[PDB]
Design an enzyme around this catalytic site. Structure first.
Site, short mmCIF file in Angstrom:
data_model
loop_
_atom_site.label_atom_id
_atom_site.label_comp_id
_atom_site.label_asym_id
_atom_site.label_seq_id
_atom_site.Cartn_x
_atom_site.Cartn_y
_atom_site.Cartn_z
N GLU A 95 0.84 -1.39 0.24
CA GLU A 95 0.00 0.09 -0.21
C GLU A 95 0.67 1.68 -0.24
O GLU A 95 0.22 2.37 -0.37
CB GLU A 95 -0.50 0.04 1.20
CG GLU A 95 -2.16 -1.34 1.24
CD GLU A 95 -3.10 -0.85 0.46
OE1 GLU A 95 -2.84 -0.04 -0.29
OE2 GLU A 95 -3.93 -1.37 0.79
N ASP A 139 -6.66 7.05 -5.44
CA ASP A 139 -5.78 5.70 -5.46
C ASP A 139 -6.47 5.24 -7.06
O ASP A 139 -6.04 5.75 -8.09
CB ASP A 139 -6.85 4.40 -5.09
CG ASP A 139 -8.67 4.05 -5.15
OD1 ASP A 139 -9.00 4.63 -6.03
OD2 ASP A 139 -8.33 2.95 -4.78
#
Length: 162
Positions: free
Chosen positions: A11, A20
């Site tokens: 991540e 994202d």
């Protein structure tokens, strides 16, 4: 290596808001702010989360606090889930982290949908369970990561990760 290390690698770490893959607002280590577009929508949420006016920037420390909460929370979603709990329980420790990784990325619900997957898994199947997984949207939108995760599951080892 552990769960925390695992996902931190997957991540990354961003101290200022960001979009994202699906184009969502996020910050820190995979912490999802809003399935929306209002960049303000997103600062509000950040604000609520830290408990301060952040203007969209936080500290490492704070990113880490979101994170713990986030890992903890996944752990309990699993243990409360009726379909997941038992899968979790039947596995060794590395494989479990993998489980936890999945859920973190896609929610108990997302995960508990692999109805099929579900038990091959429990059957101590892999391989077959693995290929099934490669045939999913998930895999197709983040293959690198998906692989590292599927690899870990199959193998019960952290190879993919070092």
């Amino acid at each position: 290596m552990n769960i925390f290390e695992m996902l931190r690698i997957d991540e990354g770490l961003r101290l200022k808001i960001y979009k994202d893959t699906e184009g969502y607002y996020t910050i820190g280590i995979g912490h999802l702010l809003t399935k929306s577009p209002s960049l303000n929508a997103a600062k509000s949420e950040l604000d609520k989360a830290i408990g301060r006016n952040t203007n969209g920037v936080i500290t490492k420390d704070e990113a880490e606090k979101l994170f713990n909460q986030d890992v903890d929370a996944a752990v309990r979603g699993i243990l409360r889930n009726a379909k997941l709990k038992p899968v979790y329980d039947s596995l060794d420790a590395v494989r479990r982290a993998a489980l936890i990784n999945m859920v973190f990325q896609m929610g108990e619900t997302g995960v508990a949908g692999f109805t099929n997957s579900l038990r091959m898994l429990q059957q101590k199947r892999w391989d077959e369970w693995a290929v099934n997984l490669a045939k999913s949207r998930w895999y197709n939108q983040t293959p690198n990561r998906a692989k590292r995760v599927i690899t870990t599951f199959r193998t019960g080892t952290w190879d993919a990760y070092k």
